[PDB]
Each structure stands twice: as C-alpha cells, then as structure tokens.
Amino acid sequence: TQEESLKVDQSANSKFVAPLLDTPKSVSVISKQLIEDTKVTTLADALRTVPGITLGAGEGGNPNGDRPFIRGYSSESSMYIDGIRNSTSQNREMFAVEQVEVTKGSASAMGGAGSVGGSINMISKVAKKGDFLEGSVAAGTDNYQRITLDGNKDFGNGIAARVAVLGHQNEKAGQSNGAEYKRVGIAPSITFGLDTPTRATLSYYYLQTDDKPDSGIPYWDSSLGKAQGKPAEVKQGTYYGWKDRDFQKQENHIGTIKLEHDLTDNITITNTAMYAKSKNDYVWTNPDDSKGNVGKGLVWHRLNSAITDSETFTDQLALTGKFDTGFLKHRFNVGAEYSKQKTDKGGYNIIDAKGNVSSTGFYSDCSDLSTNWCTSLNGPTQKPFVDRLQARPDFDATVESTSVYLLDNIEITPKWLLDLGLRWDKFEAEQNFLATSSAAAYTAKNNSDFVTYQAGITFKPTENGSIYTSYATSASPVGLNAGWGDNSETINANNQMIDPEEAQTFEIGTKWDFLDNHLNLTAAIFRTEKQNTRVQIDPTTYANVGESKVDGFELGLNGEITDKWNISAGYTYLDSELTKNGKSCRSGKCTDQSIYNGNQMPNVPKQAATLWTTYKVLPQLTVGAGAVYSDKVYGDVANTKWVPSYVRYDAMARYNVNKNVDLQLNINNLSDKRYFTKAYASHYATEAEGRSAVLAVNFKY
Numbered sequence: 001t002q003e004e005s006l007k008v009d010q011s012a013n014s015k016f017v018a019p020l021l022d023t024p025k026s027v028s029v030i031s032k033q034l035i036e037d038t039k040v041t042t043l044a045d046a047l048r049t050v051p052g053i054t055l056g057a058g059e060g061g062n063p064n065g066d067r068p069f070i071r072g073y074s075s076e077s078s079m080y081i082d083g084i085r086n087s088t089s090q091n092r093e094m095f096a097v098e099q100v101e102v103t104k105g106s107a108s109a110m111g112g113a114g115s116v117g118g119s120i121n122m123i124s125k126v127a128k129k130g131d132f133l134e135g136s137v138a139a140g141t142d143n144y145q146r147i148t149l150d151g152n153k154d155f156g157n158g159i160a161a162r163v164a165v166l167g168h169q170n171e172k173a174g175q176s177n178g179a180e181y182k183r184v185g186i187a188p189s190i191t192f193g194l195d196t197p198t199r200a201t202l203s204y205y206y207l208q209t210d211d212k213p214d215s216g217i218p219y220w221d222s223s224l225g226k227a228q229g230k231p232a233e234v235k236q237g238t239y240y241g242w243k244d245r246d247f248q249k250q251e252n253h254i255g256t257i258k259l260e261h262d263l264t265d266n267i268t269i270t271n272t273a274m275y276a277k278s279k280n281d282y283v284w285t286n287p288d289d290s291k292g293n294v295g296k297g298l299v300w301h302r303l304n305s306a307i308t309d310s311e312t313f314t315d316q317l318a319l320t321g322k323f324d325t326g327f328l329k330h331r332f333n334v335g336a337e338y339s340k341q342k343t344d345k346g347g348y349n350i351i352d353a354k355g356n357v358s359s360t361g362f363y364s365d366c367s368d369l370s371t372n373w374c375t376s377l378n379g380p381t382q383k384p385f386v387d388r389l390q391a392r393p394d395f396d397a398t399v400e401s402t403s404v405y406l407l408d409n410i411e412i413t414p415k416w417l418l419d420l421g422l423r424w425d426k427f428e429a430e431q432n433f434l435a436t437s438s439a440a441a442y443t444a445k446n447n448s449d450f451v452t453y454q455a456g457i458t459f460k461p462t463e464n465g466s467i468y469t470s471y472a473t474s475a476s477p478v479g480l481n482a483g484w485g486d487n488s489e490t491i492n493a494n495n496q497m498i499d500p501e502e503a504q505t506f507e508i509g510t511k512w513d514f515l516d517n518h519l520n521l522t523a524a525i526f527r528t529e530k531q532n533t534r535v536q537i538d539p540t541t542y543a544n545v546g547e548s549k550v551d552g553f554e555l556g557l558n559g560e561i562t563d564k565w566n567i568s569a570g571y572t573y574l575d576s577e578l579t580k581n582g583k584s585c586r587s588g589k590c591t592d593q594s595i596y597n598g599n600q601m602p603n604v605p606k607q608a609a610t611l612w613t614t615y616k617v618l619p620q621l622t623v624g625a626g627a628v629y630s631d632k633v634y635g636d637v638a639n640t641k642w643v644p645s646y647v648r649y650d651a652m653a654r655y656n657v658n659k660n661v662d663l664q665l666n667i668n669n670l671s672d673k674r675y676f677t678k679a680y681a682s683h684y685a686t687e688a689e690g691r692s693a694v695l696a697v698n699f700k701y
C-alpha cells in the first residue's frame, strides 16, 4: 500500500496545490514508514534523516528546545502543526504525528513571517474512516520504556473518533547518572460528515514532560588554554548537569476546530480555528561558561533558566480548488489568517544561605566547593543543591498578525505549469519589560507590514518528469520569537523600529518518478540568502546591513527499488558565507566582526548525507540499515569553535509473528560513535546519545 511507501507523492498541506513532482520547490517528507522503521520518538531525532538540517542549542537568552536550521537559517520561529504556526519552545514528540514535511528554501508566501531558509510542518494523525486499534509496547537499554495506543472507531454514519495515548521514559543512552526523560500524552479527535460535502473535525493534543535536562561538553583547546576549538577530550557520556538542581517541565495543549464545505465538487471553503497553550519551566547547566576552570580540571555549573507561559489563537480561512477556463487550468488556495499570542516570561534567582542573589551562579572561579557549584572535569559525581531557587518575572509579550494571500498553480498545457504566490502580512510585537537593577521599565513595540511572493515555471518533458526554475522571498520582523526563542529575533529598545530582515531563494531543479512510479529522484541547485540581515553597530544601535548566503545542491531518492528493497536517501552540499558581518557586543564593549567576512556560517555543514534502506530477507522478516553523515559544523562567526565530522549507523529487524503482531528490534548508533549534534556559538556543544537498543511488540487490528 501507499501508506507503506517511503515515497510521498502529495503534501498534506493544502497550500501546496500541486503534487510534489510538479512543485517548483524543494520539499522532503519524513514518511510514516520511515518513522515506523526508525522508531524515532522526537522531532529532533526524526530530523537526523534529513541531511543538512542542523540542530541549535540553548543558552542564557534562548530556550533549549527544538531549534532546527534549514539551509543555514533558523526555523525555530517557523514550526507548524498542520499548517498553523506553533513556535513556542518545545521538545516535540512523534506519537501523534503521521509525517513531517520539510520545506527547503524561502517560503513566506506560504507561511508569513519567517521561513527564511525553510520551515517544518508536522502533520497530525486524525480521526478517519475505517476501524482500527494499534499499539506498541517497548523496552530498551538505559531504562527506556514506551507504550503507545492508537484506536479509531468509525460509527458508520459519517462520524469517526480517534485517540492516541503515550507513556514514555528513557535515560539518555550512554550517559550514566545523566539526563532523563519522562512524558505522557493524549490526542483525541472526532470527525463528522465523512464522505459528504460538509465536514467538521474537533481535535485536542496534550503532552506533558518531567525531565532532568541535558548539559553539554565544554569547548577547550589545551595548546592555547582557552575555551575554543573542539569539545574537551573527556569520557564519552560525561554529564555536567546538576541533577538535584536542574529540571525541565513542558506542558502543551492544542485544541482545533476545522470546518469544511464543498461549494462545488471542485471548490472548498475551510475555516480552521486553533487554540494553543504552551508552558516551559527549566533550569539546566552550561558546562563552565568559558570561565577557564576546564584547564584546571574543574567545571562550574553555570545556571540557565526560564519560565514561560504562552497562549495563542489562530484562525485561517482558505478557499481552495480548481477552475478550468477552457484554456488555463487553475489550482488555487486563496485565504486570510489572524493570530494573537500572549506570553509571560520569568526565570530563577539563586539565593545562598547569606542572602546573596544571582541569576547565573556562585563560585564561578571554583574557589569554594562546599556548596557543590563546581564538579570534576573527569568523573563528575552528583551532589546536593543546597541553595534556593526563586521565580522572578521579567516581561510579557504580545504578537498579533493579519494576512491575506493568493496561491495559484496554472497549467498552461500539460507540459507547462506557472506557479504563483503573493502574500501580505501585518505584524505587531509588543513587549513590556519590568525594571531591572540597570534599567527602568519600558515597552518595546514593532509594527511591520510586508509583501512576499513566489514565482516558478515547471516544464514537464514527460508526465513523470519536471524541470523548474523558481524564485521566492521571505521577511523576518524583529520580535518574531514572540518573547522567548531564537535570540537573534529578540526585540529591545534599540531594534524595535528596524524594518524586517529580507531573504530570498533562487532555485533550479529537476524531479522524476521512475520504475512505474515506485521511485522518486529530486535534485536542486540554489542560492538561499539573507541579503538584508539585522546586525549590531554598537552596544545600543542596530541596522539591516548584514549579508549572508548559502549556495547549495540537494539530491533525494525515495521509494521501492524492488518489491523487497526500499530506500530513503539524501545528499547535500552547502557552501555558506558570512558575506558581511556587524559587531559582537557584550557588557558595553563591541568586537568588530568584519575581519570574519567570508567565513563559513555556523550551524551548517559543507556536506551531509543520509541513507535508510530495508530488505525483505524472508516473507516474515525485514532488515534495515542506516547511515547518517555530516561534515564539521562551526558554532561561531569567528569559526574557532566547532564539532567534527561524523558517521552514525543504525539497524533494524522486524519479524511478523502473525497478521496482527510484529516484533521489532532497533539498534541505534550501532558503532557507539561519540559525536555532537549541536554546537553553540560559545561555551559548549551537545553530545549525541550513545549506542542503544530497543525491542518492541507492535500490534495492529
């Protein structure tokens, strides 16, 4: 069946009005079958299958959740759930996810603000026709246990209801007395009017976590005695967090009402209303914060924290369908959107027994260990936290947007398709800051309005082939993180009046369905760039004079090579350049970065590739193998802090016990490679999980 294919022909996003073969834009789909084969449980893990998507890390001024970079540009503020932005900081789960669609290239005409290098859209499982009950019970090394249940009941009168439930725990693999994850979720929905002209779907999503959060490995260069170079040479799986102090609790609720009416057999009006509540409460450890203790065999437990509470309402109204004038065939989506988000943000003060207060920590010089503020670089041991944390409010933030767009793919003849999109956005961000020890209370506000677009031509040499050229723009206003997120987007007194950043993608490509439509190959060559980047000029002045660009190549191959052999593979070459830099400022002092003009962009590898392939060795036995490769990744503009290249292997075996029951073994990071998945701009990098195994009993009725 098609549900079992690694090749996905159509996007579930109704803003992609044409099949992916004929769409003049790069789109990768992390398919249902790939998700099942790999047993990825988080978006972050899932993204490892897409080469060149690099993950970013948190620090003092930005949260430590999902931070995907696409073609060199952060998509943290451009993460979508069924086409609606939901970009509060979260570690997103896969339990209610059908597939993940990664748009690569500038895409504001489809998504509004952001989408500079691309965007991610997670497609949810929802109630549908046909009865079924599916489940998984699994156990794995390092105290992994996971149970999921997914039941769908078709009442046979156009009504169906579905619920997925999740219970999950694991320790980070290979990291003893280290990070720990626990979470529970539920996702019930009900749909009405199946197979009729008038339809309604009510859905709810809930996920709640209770974790001991990861730390990282500090950068160190022994020759220089400085916090730079590669991560310190310490034992694999070393944890520098402070388990008695550190924690992270996330809680997310999403409620959606979607109403559809078919005005004709070819034109549908849809209204989607989404209500989201998102909380994040955390304390985690930066290993040494570049204080130099590493060179004396010690690590200071620098504290990073935040407490956020966000509520968002979004409504999208879209008219979709097709109209054939006789000469031209239009495939369209025209619409309007409104959203409003409000966020409260605070963090933690640390108070010692004498009443001293800090937001960062005590004894950063490791002069006194009696309250356990530093640990051993080699063989750290977990100790009590004996100071006190106290919640402290910092600011609130309100983002309101309104937009209208037209998307139309015009078939001129069966060989010629003209793709068009045009969108107008109005954006307002307002942030009210409480007084601090160094500044009075103030309000920052940005108002931006901007038009973005896309234009492409697709030529089809045959019905199974496409060759295209396209151009698309993006705009990214200050304050886009809506209070807490990517720190490059944070609004303040001095940038609040600045116009949006401007980006664009020029792409040429080709796509082909082969082997009786069992295989799809894609190739693209592009320049994705931010030709107007916001940069700092001095400690209290900004301007839009920066520039960067990524010249790249992407190749993708998905589907069935034979009726026993399938494949999902990708390659990318990314030649990135920080063409024109501003200054780096800290505590009133700015360092000029023009000396780094021409450097490689951080958080992007020059090359990367992934491969997943499976073979039906017996009719009841499938075996899978994967490889993930990345070149080295820089953390900083100066290109002095980095993590090395790596290859990571995976394997799988699935045995069909009977028609309803499978046993599936996954071995992850099969060679137990020590590598790093995130490189922060300073201080540290995040180690990838070590080797693990998971064994599951999967059922399907």
Ligand SMILES: CCCCCCCCOCCOCCOCCOCCO
Binding pocket: 404, 405, 406, 422, 423, 424, 449, 450, 451
């Ligand atoms: C479907 C949206 C229709 C496009 C609205 C155009 C209104 C222009 O708004 C001004 C926004 O800021 C300046 C943008 O530059 C003006 C370019 O005008 C393009 C006309 O299509």
